[PDB]
Each structure stands twice: as structure tokens, then as C-alpha cells.
Point group: C7
Chain length 281, copies 7
């Protein structure tokens, strides 16, 4: 309550002035506009009080224009057609055409109301944060009522309709906990298992002495055994950032990869192709 | 019955006070609000008694706000339009616009009611458990009425609409029995069959002496015969956990894989590529 | 007829007691509840007699709760609105809102009625049997009205909505005849045709002396001729089980594969790669 | 006309007995059941005469139960609600709920009527014949009104809904003419063209001396020229069976393939890989 | 005009006999069947004159049965319900059930009317001609109102619903001009360009001396340059037939391919693989 | 204005002859056909004047037949049912069946009106021009109201429904500017960069001395660097034709490809495969 | 306000001339056209004032023709049918046919109103700018109300319907910030890490001395480690243009690629294939 305390008063004088000239007027026309220049301004604070409650400084005011212009009609269309010109003669012709214009504007007022529920109720992002929509990572920079505007990782600008987004799973990197990496690598199946044990102990020591980039808990995983030739391995570890910071994620993971590369060849681990027999005729 | 025993009384005094000033009032207006300041509070306990029956401490109260605000209207709209201002003049104009706002809000009240059936009736998960939605494993951490919030295995946070989830098969790892592994490996077709018999007997002995990780019953399976060169094999066995514990599943299966690797080379089993003839010109 | 012979009587005394105080009452209110505390209990045995006819001990009683609660309304809503408070004043306002709540609950009562036809009329499975839904084999363990609960071959538990299942082809391994195998293998194109004739005669002798696992009728098939190098062959034979018994199917087919492997090398059949010319510069 | 000649008489006595006590009764109630215990039995022979016209001995009688139970209602609901209890008071309340239960049962009476047109009008198969639905060959063994039951080539049993089948192309091997084979093979591009001419003449002689399996007309086709290395060829010929006989088709085509294999090496035709230059450093 | 000149007379005598006993009858019942045993036979020639206009000798008469049986109802249902038993009492009950049976039979009368527009108005084929539906070539042999029956190139018989065909592109080989071939072949990149010029001149001479199979205008096209190793080429030419004649198309194109094969090796053109360096350790 | 100046007169005499015998007739029947043999011929010039405005000489006249036959009904059905036989008795029965035949013919009058907007308003092609629909290039040769008839590049004739085409992107080669080529080629990564500079200067000189086929502006592009082995390059240039002329495009691009081929080997550019180490055991 | 200040006057004289001959006429017909030759010209400035507000000089005037012709009807159809010929006799027959022509023209007035919201409200592009629709880059050159016309990168012209575009994500290169490049390259895993450090320092120096094409900030990224053989790397950098300038983007990136190529071989970096063991028999 900040402005309703002083602006609802501007409807309150007319709430006083429709009780004034009803007793002095009835000791019908000007009697019946005083309650319709009031029925608007009471329908006007139900706007401003149920819209000083609400999730975007662009879409809240593109919404305010929308309910103002449909409550500056259901005042007027009940002023003339329900309070001055007498009822039930033209009151049931415009309701064919009102019902007729909901074969035209009906499906696109359906998409406007599903976009208001996506933006204000479901609310999966704010301006400024990096999101994933199909597998495409995209930064938000404008939220309108019918469209979100995104930037891609190459800075290309995308216009996406909010009613199509309202049926999809959306990721948000800004609202996430600190996120995890994968680095994969392959070694020879005939690596001794004491060298796989020294490799694991040496990975874990690299991550303990870099606490500012990596969390301490990790795992080294064997994923496949191929042709009795190849072990496919992976390392799982945790960042101290999310993937909101795209450039910093790529740089820290480049440096982890080049450190694994150096451990593998201090320990004399490699990979070799399967031998081939040749029958020479 | 805990609070209805003392809060239904707050409707009961008004059930006494509408029988009071009907006899003293009829030895119409204030007669006709006493049954509408009652018709609400009887429609209010049908809320609180059919909602102290119900499957989320966030969604039960986001639901309570929803039926409270539509039963704080079908009290008022039958107070004014069916109990004070006399009927059948404005009683059949608002029902065009009521029918008109179900070309707007109709499809999105359809998705709100399908999301309430998914959450409270179908109920496939609770907060805290790991689920699979397309092939993506995802931990639940917030259940709302229109959206479930998930975390992925890299801790990325996903906002998924509940009306799209209500048409899909959903797995739940927490509600499962103890789950099974597969480890695949390939050996040479000309492996003698006494070495395949020693391999099977040595696999089964590893699983019997590790009862805390593996169940005793398992099977070793030949899946293909390729080019008279390669036998493709698999081992099926059972965990003593489900896949809810993701990090522990990967670690126990890494250790099973490195044990198969060591059996295969104690028994001198290998795999070799097919020979090649060379005609040298 | 077991309980209807003694429980329809509890409606029959009220069928006697509405003919009693109609003659003593007419030598309107208490006259008009005696036929509505009867119209329920006659609408109650049409429940219990057309539901002691029916295909799940969980879904029959989750269904009984559903028709009981809509026949404990179309008693009451014709008691008050068609037998006590006089007609055609409020009788045509609630039928806007009744028609209004079929933009909300209408599509989800459509899916409830398609799920009752799938479960009770189409009836493709029972609890306990192994089924195939897309290519995924799945054991049934709970049939509800809106959801079937499955277990996969790794024991992961799946919640599948019955209205999506009602549009798919569903296999049932339990209701099947004894099922057939395929084992494929490849041999060299320049295998003499007297060795293919000894191979066929030796396959058929293995299947005749194992009658407890294999049926006698089978076929050995040539499927492709490749590059004048490779014959792709298959063996088709029949189990004495269905694929309901998953672990036993895999074990018996592993033993057939290792027996083919031993026939092929008693007969000196192999496969070789195409030769290569080398021009040495 | 076999049973209608003697069973329409059982409506004819009541056609005589409603003309009897209309003149002796009018020299209203028992007058108005005599034409409704008649209006059924005339609506009963329009059943039995337009259903002794009709394409399955299971589905004709699952259909007879269906129209009997909706003509044992539109007798009764015009007996009570249009011939005894006087009109236009309850005659326009049940038609809200009748219109209400076509938001529930309406889409599933839509699928029941599309399944009756598929089974009886479109009629693409009978019980006992082998059909192809997506590329899957399937034998029919039960035709119901809502589901067809199939067996696959491994004897797995499939339950397929008839309303999904009614939108697909369906093949029928039993209703087909005698069907054609393809056998493909590859030869060397530098095969002389007099050897391709002897091969064609020797294929055609094999098919003339086996008239009981193969038709005489055939074609030998060159499909591609690859890398100036490989000619891809095919032989097209005709069976004296359809593919209804699955096991016999596979056996006769295995024997054609092994005969092509023997012609190719009597004529000294082969295939060789492209040569390779080696620069030895 | 052949039969309407003598069969419209059989309605004309009743056009004379309803003007006869209206003056002798009015100097109401038998007055009001004479105009309904006329209103049919005038509605009967509007059938036979607007159906002796029309595109299949099976579907025209399966259609004639369909409009005869709905004009042998809208005679009777306006005879009894609009010309004998007096109006507006039962005239507005059957129109609930008439409106009710268009939730049942409505979607399948929608597919019957879209199939009549496909067959008679869009008309993309006749019986006997070879068509392409997805990439599958198929000969037409029966056109019904709801289904077309096809044969494939292996003589398998397909039942295809006409309402699914009405949304697809359909090719017709019989209605086409004479159609074109492609033969592809690959040569070595280091082929001199005077040999590519002799090859083109020798292709064009083969096509000029075979005018009965090939049109004179053609083109020889270079499609790719690969790895400075391979030129991918094609020859485009024209048949003197369409692809309706499937067996003759395959035979003439086999003979063109074997002639290209012989030109290429008279001109000493070939293709060779890229050389390989070997470092021998 | 050419024929409306003399043919609207044939309605004008009847505009004079309905004002004639209204004063001599009223100093009701023949009074009420003179305004309905007029209401047609005024509704007839609104046809011929709003259809001498309109984009196909086949579809304009297949359209003229369509609006003539629905304005030769809404003359007659307001002649008999609104100007001779008196109103509001049969005026509200045919409007059930009129509303009934829009469950039958309603969806196919929806596709007829979307096809008229595609053909006359959207208008993406004319007869005679080459278009691309999915990636298939197709020449137009007949435009009807419900179907376009195309020819493919092999002269196969396609019947495509206009309501499916109205939802797709359609290319038009005839309405295009002069179109561009791509020729790709690969060279060795260790090509010196002075040879890539001479190649570019020699490409550009070929295009300047052939101005009748190629525009002067072009670009030579490096697209990938592969394995430090291969540069993948492309040349982009412009035709002086569109791709309407299919045979001429293929011939001019064959000659550009064979000219690039000759530049590359005057400059001694090639491509070689990566070397291989051999450890000889 | 430019022309409304002088053209609303042309309605204002008729606003003066309907107040003139109402007092001189009433001291009904010509009284009732003066308010309908006024009701148009007041409905005419609500056109010109709410359309001198509005996003294309072709579509604004193709829109002006559209609302002019539906406000030159809802003047006339309320002139004759609501102000001259008296009401409620023909006032409720044309509203069947008005409701009937919204089974015909209803879905295509739905697509016209969704195309007006795409063009004027969502507004994702203007004429002249390069956009991406599926992955296809396309220059805009005509915006109509129902169709956008595009040119592709080869100058092929595409006609795309605006109602299909209104459901897709659309990129706009003209409205973007300066955009980013990727160049990928592969090096040998056994490259020393001091050579990867000199490569990074030498890349960054090339980008600093070319400020007119490249931004200074960049990153060099290791993406995979393959088989202990290959490092897959990438360089990310920024243009000083967007991809609107297609030809200039390709030329600047060709020159960056040829500069990386020259750094790699000044530093003696390469890539080699994995060695092979040969067992020579």
C-alpha cells in the first residue's frame, strides 16, 4: 500500500457524488452515468491493486495496457448498452457478432492467456540468465508477453514465441547449484592395474591442490571394455561455478584436460591398435 | 478430525443466527445475507474437510488458495446475483461473458485440472527421488501444481510442465526393487569351451565372496556369433541398491569390470582380428 | 446371485414403506423424500449387480468408489432440485455452471472413460505377466484405473498412463504359444555344398536329442550372398517355453549357440576375408 | 429368410392384440403400453433382419449384444418418458445429462463406430491369414469389435486396436496372386560379357526344369556400376505360392540361392577388390 | 438423356394423380400421402439425373446405394413427421437424438464425404495403372468408396484407406509423358580430357542408332570432384515408354549399362585408389 | 467494364418490370416472384463483376461454376421459403438438417476455401514454372481448385492437394534473380600458400573471359582444416540464368568443373593420404 | 495528428446535418439514413486514427483495404437490417447463414488474424535483413499479410506462409551484436605443452594486429582427447560485423584459417596416425 492510499480517493469523491444527486435528483439519464463513471473507477482500482501485486518491468506494463483497454470497454458497453439505452432490443444482436468474433480472435486470445501463465506463474527465468531450450544454450534479454528474445553463444538473436516455450522443458543455469564436468579418455586394456591405481591417486591430488576451481569429491569410472583392446574411461568432477559463465567453464576444463594428458604420460600409459596377421602369397 | 471439531463451530453460530432473526424478522435483504454469510461457511468446511484428506506440502497449499478463491466467488455471485438483486434481468447477460471467457481461460483451466490429477491421483514420485523421463535421469526437488523442478546428473535445473509429463512413462528408482547390471565383453570364437567353462565358474566365485555388493544369482550369456571370429558375451547380475545411488552404482560396476578383466587374462583368453592374404605383384 | 438375494431386501422395506405412508399421508415434503430415499437404493443395486459382473481386484474397487460417488449425487441433486424445492427457477442456472465445468473436467473425464474401456473391455494383460510395449519388455504388477505399473528387465519401475497405452499394440508373452528362436552365423561362400548338407543334418540331430528344450521342426536358411565372399545364414527353431521366462530363454539359447560353434569346427567350415593385391613401388 | 418367417409372428400377435383392446378399451395407461410392448418387437426385427444380413462369427454376436442393449433402452425411455408419464416437464432435464454424458462417452463411441466400419465394411482380412501392418507380418486369429489379435512369426501374440488399424495400409498375403522373389549378388566389373550371357542362359534353364516351384518368366537385372569394380545384379522370379506359406517360401529361396552359387563357379565368375599402390619409404 | 425420357414418366402419372383427387377430394390423410409418394419420385430423378452424370463402375453404384437409402428416409421422415402426424410435439425430441447420433456417426460420415471428393473430383488414377504413393510403386485394381486396392511389384495386395490417400501427393505413370533414366558411373580424376570427349561422342552414337528405345537428346554430367581422385559422373537420357511398363524399363536400362561398360574399356578409362606411404620401422 | 455495360441491362428490364406490375397489381404470389426473378439477377452481376476482377484460366472458370450453383440456390431457397410459402413453420426444420450437413460437408468446404486463398491470394506460381516443394523440383502444368499437377525432372506426373501445399514453403525458380553455383574440391594441407594464390587468380581469369555464362564476382572459400591433412575448399559463383533451365545449368556447371580440374594440375596441386607406420614383427 | 484535423470535419458536417433535419423533420426513413451515413464516417475515423498509428508500407495498406471492406458492411447491414426495414423477422434468418459461413471461412479468418499479430505485434524482422528459419539463412524482401517472401543464399525465392512462421523461432542477423567465429583443428596428442603455449601466444598476436576484423578477446579450447592420439581443438573469436554480411564473413574467416595453417607449421606441430603391428606369416 503506497499509492492506493491516495489514488482510490479519486474514485471516492465520485462515490460521494453519486450518493449526492440521487437524493437531490429523486426528491434517469444523468442519474445513470454517475454510477457508470463510478463503476469504472472501482473496476480501475481492482486493476491497480491486483497489478501492484505483480515478474517483468516490461511485461507488467505491456499487461497493464491490456487490461486497461478491456476495462475501458466493459465500462462503456455496460454504460450505453446496460444503463442508458433501454435493454433487450439491441442487447441480443451484438452478441451474435461478439460470438462471431470468437471464431476470429479466439485462438489468439488463447495464446495470449497461455503466455501470461508462462511468464508470471510458471516463471522459469529472468532477464540476464542462460537457459537451455532444446540443446541450445541461450541468454535471456527481453521478456515480452508474446515473445522471449534470446542471444546464442555466437551472439545471434532469436525471437521465440512464448506459447511454444510453454510446452517444453527449460533449463536455467543461473538458478542451479555448482555444476559438474566429464572428461573422457581411452587406455589400453593391458594396462596393469597398479598403474590404474596410481593414476587415480594422482588425479585426486591434482584436484586437492586446486580448490578454487574444483570440488574435492570425484570419481573415475570404467565405462566399456572393447574387443579386449580398449578401456573407455571417464572422470567426473565438480566446478565451483555454473555454466552461466560459459567462457570460464571452457578454460578451466581445457586446463584439466591438459593435466590428465600429462599424468598419463608420466605413468607410461598408452593405447595401441590390435595386431594384424599377414599371409603373404 | 482435529480442527473441524472446533472450527465448524464458527459456521454453527451463524447456523443458529439465521434461525434466530427469521422468526423475529418474519413475526427481505438482511434476511437474505444471513443465508449467504452461511452458505459460504458451509461451502468452507467442504473445502477444509476434503482438503485435510490430501501428496505435497507445497501443492496442497497452492491448491488451497485456488479453491478458496473460487468459493469466495460462488458465494458472492450467488449472494448478489441470486439472493439480493432480483433475478432474470442481468442474470442472463453475464452468462454470455462467462461463456465468452471460456474461449480465453478455458484451455488453461484444462491444463490446470490435468495437472492436479497427475500430482494427486496418478502420483508417480515424491520430493527427493530420482526418476527417468526420456532417458534422462532426474532428481525431484519441487512439486508445484503446474511444474515439477528437477536436477540432472550434472546438477542442471530443469523446469518441466506437469501437463506434458502426464502423457509420458515415468520411471522411479526409489520405488524400485534392487536393480540389475550388464557388463559386456568380446572374446575370440576359437576359445576352447573348457576355458569358457572355467570363466563362468570363476565369475560366480567372485560374486559369492562379495555378498555385500552383489546378489548370488547371475547369468553369462552369448549374444552373437560374428564372422566366425568373435563371440559377443554379457554378464547379468544384481546390485544390492537401486540406481537412486548414482555414484555408488558407478563405483561398484567399475570394480566388477576390472575384475572380469583380470579373470580373462589369468585364463589366457583373448581376441584376435581376422587374417589377411596379400598377393604381392 | 449371492448377496443381492439378501441386500436388495434393504431397499425392499423402503419399497414397502413408500407405499405405506402415501395412503395414510394422502387419506408433500415427507411424501417426496420417501421416493428419493428409495430412488437411491434402487439406483444402488443397479450398481452392485452390474459390478458383481466385473477384471482386476484393485480397479474394480477403485471403480466402485467412482460410481458410488456419482450416484450419491444424482440422487441428491434430484432430491433437492427435482423433488423438494420447486422447479424451473434455480433449475436453469446450475446448468450453466454444469456446462461450465465441462470445459475444465471434461477432457479428463474423457481419459477416465477410455481407461475403463482399456482395462475392462479390451483387457490385454493381467497382473503378473510380461508384455512388450514399444520394444521394451515389461512385467505387470499393478493395474489401476488411470495407470499401469510395470517392471523392466533390470527391475526399474515404470508408471505408464492407460490412455496412452490404449492407442498402441501390446504383446503378451504369457498368453502366447511356445515361441521361436533365431541364431545367425556367417560362413565362407566357397564352402562346398556337401559340407552345408552335413551341417544341416548335424543340426537336426542335436535338436532331436534334446526334446525337452527344442521342438523337432526347424529350418536352416540362406539369407544373403555377399560379394562372392560370405553366406549369411540363420537357424530358426522353437522353444518349449514362451519368453515370459526370460532367464531360461537366454540360457537355452546360449547353449544352442555354443553347440553350433562346435559343429562348425568339427566340419572344418570357416570364413575368410577377401584377398588384396599390392603393387609395390 | 429362415427364422424371420416364424419369429416376426411373435410380434404379430401383439400387433393383433393392440388392435383388440383399443376398441374394447375405447368403446390411457394400459392402452399406452400395448403400443410400447409392440414398438420394441418391431424395433426388434429391424435388428434381426438387418443383422442376419451380416463378416465374423465373434464380432457379429458381440455386435448383436450392443444394438440389443440400445434398443432395449429406446423402447423403455420412450415408454416411460414418452408414453406414460406426461411430457415436457422432466423431458427437458435428462437431455442436459444426456448431452452431458457425451463429453464422457462421446469419444469412445466414436471409436466404436469407426471400428465397425473397419471390420464390416472395409473388411481387409479374415481369421487365419497373414497380413503386414508396418513391415511386420502377422497372422490373424481373433477379430473382436475393438481389437484384432495377431501372432507374429516367432508366435508372439499382439493385441492391436482396430481404430488405429483403420488409418493404415494393410497387406494381405492370402488374397494375393502368386508372389515374387529377389536374389541379389555382385560380380566383378571386368567379367566378360560372354560370361554374363552364359549365366543368363543357365539361370533360365534352372527355372524351366523346376516348374513346380518357379514360373518361367524372370529377369536378370544390372542395378549399379560401382567404382569400375563391381556390378550389382539381381534376379527377379515368381513363386507358385504366396507368402502366406512362410516356411515354404524360405526353403525354396534357399535352394535357389545355392543354385546360383553353383552356376557362378562353374562359369568361373568372381569378384575381386581394387588394387592398392604402396610407396615404401 | 436416354432413360430419364421414359422413367421420369413413372413419376409423372403420380404428378397427374395428385392433381386428380385434390379436386375430387376437396370438392386430409390420403390427400397427404399423394404428395409424399410424389415427393420421393421427384427426389428420385434428381438422384438418377445427377448420377447419370458421373468415374468408376464400382464406386458409382456403391454410391447409388448410398443416396438411395438416404432419400428413402427423408421421404419417409417427412411423410410421417411432416405430413401425417401433426407437428411440433415429437418434432423436437428426435432432433436431440439426431443431434446425438452425430457424436457417433459424425466423424465417419466426414471420412465418407472426403473419400467421394477424392474419387470423383480429385480423381488421380483409374483402374489399371501404376502409381507411386510414398516411394512405393503400386498398380490399381479396385476403387471402392472407402478403400483403394493396390498390387505391389512383388504382387502383394494392399488395402489403403481413401481418406489417408487424400492428403498425400500421388504419382501416375500411365498419365505421364515418356520418362527419363539415370545411369551413374565413376572414373579417375586423372583421366585426360580428350578421353572424356571421346566417351561423350561414343555415348551419343549408341543412342542415335537405337531410336526405338532411346530419344536422341541426352546429357553427360560431372557431379562431384572427390579428393582429387574420383570424378562422379551421370548420364541422363529418355525412354520411349513410361515406367508403367516396369519389366521393360529394367531390361532396357540393363542393356544401356552394359554398353557403357564396354565403351569405358575400349577407351582405356579406369579408376584407381589413392596411393599409400608406408614407413617401415 | 466491357460486358457488364450490356449484360446488366438484362437485369435492368426486370428492374423496370417489377416496378410496373406493382402499381397495376396493387391499384401476392406473382407480385413475389418478380422480386425473386430480380434478386437473382442482381446477385448475378455481383458474381460477374467480382469475378471479372480475377489468376488461372482453368480455376477461374471452375470457380465460376461453384458460385453460380450456390447463388442459384440462395435465390430459390429464399424464393420458396422466404417469399411464397409463408414463414416460420418449415423455416425452422430445414435448419436442423442444414446444420446437420455441416458435420458432413463442413470439413471439405473448409478445404475448398483454403485452396481458393492459396490459388488466388497467396498465388506462389503460374503454369509453366519450376518450383521446389520439399527438395523436389517440379514444373507446374495444371492449376485446379483442389489440386496442382506437377512434372518431375524425370517427367513423372504428380497430383498434389492444394490444402497441403498451403502450409509449406514453396520456391519458384522462374521468379528468382540469376542464381548461384557451388563447386567443392579438396587439396592437400601442405600446399604452399603461393600456389593457393595462383589458383585464385587463375579461377578469376576463367570467369572474366566467359561473361556469357558467369558473373564476374565470386569467392574462393576454405571451409575446414582436417587432421592437418586436407583443406576443404569451395568456389561460389553466379549464373546468368536461373535453375528454371535445368539442362543448361547442368551443362555449364560440368564445364566449370572440368576447368577447375585442369587448373589444379597445371599448378601441380594434389592431395595425398596420411602416412602409416608399420612395426614388423 | 496531421490529416485527422481536416478529414474528421467531413464527418462533422454530417454530424451537424443529422441534428438539423431531426428538429425540422420532427417539428422515419430519411431520418434513419442520416444517422447511418454518419455511423459509417464515425466508424471511418476509428479506422484512420487507429491505422495511422501503425510496421510495413505494403501490409499496412493491404490491411487498410481489409478493415475498410468490413466496415463498409457493418454500416450497410445495420442500415438496412437495423435502421430501415423493421426488425426481428429477417433479423434471425441471416444469422443461420452467418453462422453457417463460419464453418467455411472460419479457419481462414483464424489464420488471417494470427498473421496480423505476427507481423505487427510480434514483428521479428523488417524488409532487407537476413534471418534464419530452420537452419536456412534467408533475406527478407516482401512482407505481405499472409506470406513473407525470402531469398536464399543462392538467390532462390521462397514463399513462406506467415501462420506457419508464427510458431517457430526466428533469428535476425541484422538486429544482433557483432557475432562470433569457430575454427577447428586437430593436433597430435604427443605435442609438447610448450608448443601449445607458443601456439596460443602466437594466435593472440595475430588477432591484436588485425583490429579491424577481429576483437581482442578470444579463447583456445581443447575439446576431446581421442585414443591417446588426437587432441581436438578450437579457436573462438569475434567479428566486427554480423552475419548479415555473408560474403565478407566467409572471406575473413578464410584468411584466419590460412593464418592458423601457417602458425602450425612454423612451430612444427603435426598430427600422425596410430602405428600398426604386423605379424608376418
Amino acid at each position: 500500500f503506497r499509492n492506493v492510499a491516495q489514488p482510490f480517493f479519486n474514485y471516492i469523491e465520485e462515490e460521494d457524488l453519486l450518493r449526492f444527486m440521487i437524493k437531490e435528483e429523486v426528491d434517469d439519464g444523468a442519474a445513470e452515468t454517475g454510477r457508470i463513471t463510478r463503476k469504472a473507477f472501482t473496476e480501475w482500482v481492482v486493476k491497480v491493486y491486483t497489478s501492484r501485486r505483480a515478474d517483468t518491468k516490461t511485461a507488467v506494463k505491456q499487461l497493464n495496457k491490456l487490461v486497461t483497454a478491456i476495462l475501458m470497454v466493459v465500462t462503456v458497453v455496460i454504460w450505453l448498452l446496460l444503463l442508458e439505452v433501454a435493454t433487450t432490443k439491441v442487447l441480443l444482436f451484438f452478441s451474435t457478432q461478439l460470438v462471431a468474433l470468437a471464431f476470429i480472435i479466439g485462438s489468439t486470445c488463447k495464446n495470449l492467456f497461455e503466455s501470461i501463465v508462462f511468464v508470471f506463474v510458471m516463471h522459469p527465468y529472468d532477464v540476464g540468465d542462460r537457459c537451455v531450450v532444446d540443446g541450445v544454450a541461450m541468454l535471456v534479454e527481453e521478456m515480452n508477453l508474446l515473445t522471449t528474445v534470446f542471444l546464442k553463444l555466437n551472439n545471434e538473436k532469436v525471437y521465440y514465441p512464448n506459447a511454444v516455450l510453454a510446452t517444453k522443458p527449460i533449463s536455467n543455469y543461473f538458478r542451479s547449484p555448482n555444476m559438474g564436468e566429464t572428461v573422457e579418455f581411452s587406455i589400453s586394456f593391458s594396462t596393469p592395474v597398479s598403474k590404474i591405481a596410481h593414476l587415480k591417486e594422482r588425479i585426486a591430488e591434482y584436484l586437492e591442490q586446486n580448490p578454487q576451481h574444483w570440488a574435492p569429491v570425484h570419481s573415475v569410472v570404467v565405462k566399456e571394455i572393447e574387443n579386449m583392446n580398449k578401456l573407455k574411461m571417464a572422470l567426473y568432477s565438480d566446478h565451483t561455478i555454473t555454466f552461466q559463465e560459459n567462457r570460464e567453464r571452457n578454460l578451466r576444463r581445457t586446463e584439466l584436460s591438459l593435466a590428465i594428458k600429462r599424468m598419463l604420460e608420466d605413468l607410461h600409459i598408452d593405447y595401441t591398435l590390435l595386431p594384424q596377421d599377414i599371409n603373404l602369397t
